[PDB]
Design a protein around this ligand. Structure first.
Ligand SMILES: CO[C@H]1[C@@H](O)[C@H](O)[C@H](OC[C@@]23C[C@@H]4[C@H](C)CC[C@H]4[C@@]4(C=O)C[C@@H]2CC(C(C)C)[C@@]34C(=O)O)O[C@@H]1C
Ligand SMILES: Nc1nc2c(ncn2[C@@H]2O[C@H](COP(=O)(O)OP(=O)(O)O)[C@@H](O)[C@H]2O)c(=O)[nH]1
Ligand SMILES: [Mg+2]
Length: 819
């Protein structure tokens, strides 16, 4: 319990300050460990409440300990800011913001589960902020009580967990920081049980056995970990796990640190009442009062807390190893600062100079009980902030030249953020964490306060600006459609970054910048904008139905009358030609002569075939054609309209599963009609032509084509590797890798492989890659559309079931009428 004066005095010696947080996978004990720290060293002031965002700890080290600190120290008192970090670990920017205001981290790892993805994710983000890590292998009690594990097994488990961790560190830590790996012998690894309240470092044991083995602890802690053995027979320390005779030697870690602990557990839990007093006496543990009566776990919990208080182990690593702001801001300055590295503000950050202009980073806005008011939480990197001080509030889009996001206003009050409470203070110098009241309106989320007109903004969060996340929206009650269509308009108008359009398959699509953005949009659309139950789902992907080769044999079909017959074959239309039709070089209404000259001279077509195209389809202009190759059919001219109409019908609804055809050419080889027009009416010939077309189609090695996106991704070099990793998992294909900004990888990504892509990409690039996608072209899947188990077939079977059609695709024989 300190007074505002004591706190302010503590905050002057930033050399003795430690800004850090606890990194842990859910359930690994992050909470009970901080409760332990708070109960042991928490600080409290000697009716407005807030959400606990940070806690202050106080610690004193012995004069000898302080000498061991490899960094500028002023006295034996230390102020530790334990900063709260979100629990969402998706490489989110909320987490990055929280870490940004810290310099060191206490990483919690489970004895049994070891390092899990969640752990790797926050640690990776932390390393990206040049944060120094220190580890605590937690839940050790489980291995002793539940699993009955042996000393060497426990050792091995510890060593493997430490290795897993230093793999992540060696991979993502900036080489400029040197070796930021963790070493038990150097005291950067603690072992214990946050629930039982005990933990230790090799250092503490070295201190305990140094003055006992007649050796300095520097020598002792190297010997208390890894391959160091003490042969009681020779009384010597060696690095060989066997003696001269070759007999097995027990590792020093097991023999001097684990065994005493193992013996305490075994004796106390088995009620060996004549073995416990001696063991406790030897370890110099003293039970007082009612404690002398405890037994079992109760006695154990109490004995271990006295023998190795947890908080003590943790505070030791924090003070001795985690960097102070002075130490850290020296190598973190440039990243933190967007401006010039030679800039006056950057230098003030490197020096953690309290007399320079203000450079205060706003980490986030915290909820208070002061009727809808949010206090700004952050860290003073340069200068000192004062109550009633005129400062310059610069949002995420501010630039020294423009007046965007700029907001000059006085800071109403500077408060200490102590748990759920606040404490008004007059000022706060560089190196400290602090809360600002009165910044609510001008800043929401991150920002940057300065007292210099030149001041550049501190590292801002990079956010997506492309509608890469999209879903299909539909009313649960058909009659509501009008409100939905209206709601989308209202939604679009209110949000610049939101996009809505109708898909090729007839679904309303709503797309957002990121998953979160899209979620707000859908919530607002459903609740306000449209105000009606909406149904959300992955947009249906549209496909095309084409042929890979000519009909293996003439297609023959007759009319209902059985009097008329059409003979035809289908063949592929070249992509360049389909494209030419789709894009305007070859047009439905152009003069057939000039068009045929182009198709023949420039595209390899036979000019007679070209001069004889009867129509394009579907809709009279699609990339499918009917060419007349008949020789002496008498009443040909009279059935033309029926044939054309049937084609518009056939190309609009393919026989594979009802999708439109594309790149399909149909050659009419011959037609036999009835002499009297009354048996050659459209009602007779339209079905014939459609039936024959479907047959020629199916006889031409049918295939479906899928939509393919052109995806453009901006990101930093070291992250590019994740891009290729994801793409390869999604039938992707790289197109171009260009560039002294970032990189930009361009690739083709099948549309049916893009649902959730944005998520898997941030996950594979540590949230550093930013996707952009636009429809590019159609691609023919080589697999059999009629084989329910091939890639194409699965897609066809899913669409058929979804539409209530029979599963089996009718084969060509179903449309062929034998002579
Ligand atoms: C500017 O934003 C763009 C990009 O997001 C992208 O080009 C997107 O693509 C939409 C699709 C466009 C394709 C062409 C019209 C023909 C095939 C169409 C698609 C159907 O599967 C592929 C993509 C993704 C779609 C379905 C799944 C919605 C498309 C559609 O509109 O149905 O369109 C919007 C407007
Ligand atoms: N056996 C054991 N359980 C623990 C230990 N520390 C925490 N737990 C338990 O693990 C669960 C999650 O703990 P908590 O501190 O909330 O973890 P967090 O959510 O990651 O912060 C709770 O049921 C705890 O009682 C420990 O050292 N040993
Ligand atoms: Mg917790």
């Amino acid at each position: 319990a300190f007074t505002v004066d004591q706190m302010r005095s503590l905050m002057d010696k930033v050399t003795n300050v430690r800004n850090m947080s606890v990194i842990a996978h859910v359930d690994h004990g992050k909470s009970t460990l901080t409760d332990s720290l708070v109960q042991r060293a928490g600080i409290i002031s000697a009716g407005i409440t807030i959400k606990s965002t940070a806690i202050s700890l106080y610690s004193e080290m012995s004069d000898e300990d302080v000498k061991e600190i490899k960094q500028k120290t002023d006295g034996n008192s230390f102020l530790i800011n334990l900063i709260d970090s979100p629990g969402h670990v998706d490489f989110s920017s909320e987490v990055t913001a929280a870490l940004r205001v810290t310099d060191g981290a206490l990483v919690v790892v489970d004895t049994i589960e070891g390092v899990c993805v969640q752990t790797e994710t926050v640690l990776r983000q932390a390393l990206g902020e040049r944060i120094k890590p220190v580890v605590v292998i937690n839940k050790v009690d489980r291995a002793l009580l539940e699993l009955q594990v042996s000393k060497e097994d426990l050792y091995q488990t510890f060593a493997r967990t430490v290795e897993s961790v230093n793999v992540i560190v060696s991979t993502y830590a900036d080489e400029v920081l040197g070796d930021v790996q963790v070493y038990p012998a150097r005291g950067t690894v603690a072992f214990g049980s946050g629930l039982h309240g005990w933990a230790f470092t090799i250092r503490q044991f070295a201190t305990r056995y140094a003055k006992k083995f007649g050796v300095d602890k520097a020598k002792m802690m190297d010997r208390l970990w890894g391959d160091s053995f003490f042969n009681p027979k020779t009384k010597k320390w060696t690095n060989k796990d066997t003696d001269a005779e070759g007999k097995p030697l027990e590792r020093a870690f097991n023999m001097f640190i684990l065994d005493p602990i193992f013996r305490l557990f075994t004796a106390i839990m088995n009620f060996k009442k004549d073995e416990i007093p001696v063991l406790l006496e030897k370890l110099e543990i003293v039970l007082k009062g009612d404690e002398k009566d405890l037994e079992g776990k109760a006695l154990l919990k109490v004995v271990m807390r006295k023998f190795l208080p947890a908080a003590d182990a943790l505070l030791e690593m924090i003070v001795l190893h985690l960097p102070s702001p002075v130490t850290a801001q020296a190598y973190r300055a440039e990243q933190l600062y967007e401006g010039p590295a030679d800039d006056a503000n950057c230098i003030a950050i490197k020096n953690c100079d309290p007399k320079a202009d203000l450079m205060l980073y706003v980490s986030k806005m915290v909820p208070t009980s002061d009727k809808g008011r949010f206090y700004a939480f952050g860290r003073v990197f340069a200068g000192t902030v004062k109550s009633g001080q005129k400062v310059r509030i610069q949002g995420p889009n501010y630039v020294p030249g423009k007046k965007d996001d700029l907001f000059i206003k006085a800071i109403q009050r500077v408060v200490l953020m102590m748990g759920r409470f606040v404490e008004p203070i007059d000022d706060c110098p560089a190196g400290n964490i602090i809360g600002l009241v009165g910044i609510d309106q001008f800043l929401l989320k991150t920002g940057t306060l300065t007292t210099s007109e030149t001041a550049h903004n501190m590292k801002v969060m990079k956010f997506s600006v492309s509608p890469v996340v999209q879903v299909a929206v539909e009313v649960k009650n058909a009659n509501d459609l009008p409100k939905l269509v209206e709601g989308l308009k209202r939604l679009s108008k209110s949000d610049p970054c939101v996009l809505t359009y109708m898909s090729e398959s007839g679904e309303h699509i709503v797309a957002g910048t990121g998953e979160l953005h899209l979620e707000i949009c859908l919530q607002d659309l459903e609740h306000d904008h449209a105000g009606v139950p909406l149904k959300i789902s992955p947009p249906v992907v549209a496909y095309r139905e084409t042929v890979e080769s000519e009909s293996s044999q003439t297609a023959l079909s007759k009319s209902p009358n059985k009097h008329n017959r059409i003979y035809l074959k289908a063949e592929p239309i070249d992509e360049e030609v389909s494209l030419a039709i789709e894009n305007g070089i070859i047009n439905p209404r152009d003069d057939f002569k000039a068009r045929a000259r182009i198709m023949a001279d420039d595209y390899g077509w036979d000019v007679t075939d070209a001069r004889k195209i009867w129509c394009f389809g579907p809709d009279g202009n699609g990339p499918n054609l009917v060419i007349d190759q008949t020789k002496a059919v008498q009443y040909l001219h009279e059935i033309k309209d029926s044939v054309v109409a049937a084609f518009q019908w056939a190309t609009k609804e393919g026989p594979i599963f009802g999708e439109e055809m594309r790149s399909v050419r149909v050659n009419i080889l011959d037609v036999t009609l009835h002499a009297d027009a009354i048996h050659r009416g459209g009602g007779q010939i339209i079905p014939t032509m459609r039936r024959a077309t479907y047959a020629g189609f199916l006889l031409a090695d049918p295939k479906i084509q899928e939509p393919v996106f052109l995806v453009e991704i901006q990101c930093p070099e070291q992250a590019v590797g994740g891009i290729y990793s994801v793409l390869n998992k999604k039938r992707g294909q790289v197109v171009s890798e260009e560039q002294t900004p970032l990189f930009t990888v361009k690739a083709y990504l099948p549309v049916n492989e893009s649902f959730g892509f944005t998520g898997e990409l941030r996950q594979a690039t540590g949230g550093q890659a930013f996707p952009q996608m636009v429809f590019d072209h159609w691609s023919t899947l080589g697999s059999d559309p009629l084989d329910p188990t091939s890639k194409a077939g699965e897609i066809v079977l899913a669409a058929r079931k979804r539409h209530g059609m029979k599963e089996e695709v009718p084969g060509w024989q179903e449309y062929y009428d034998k002579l």
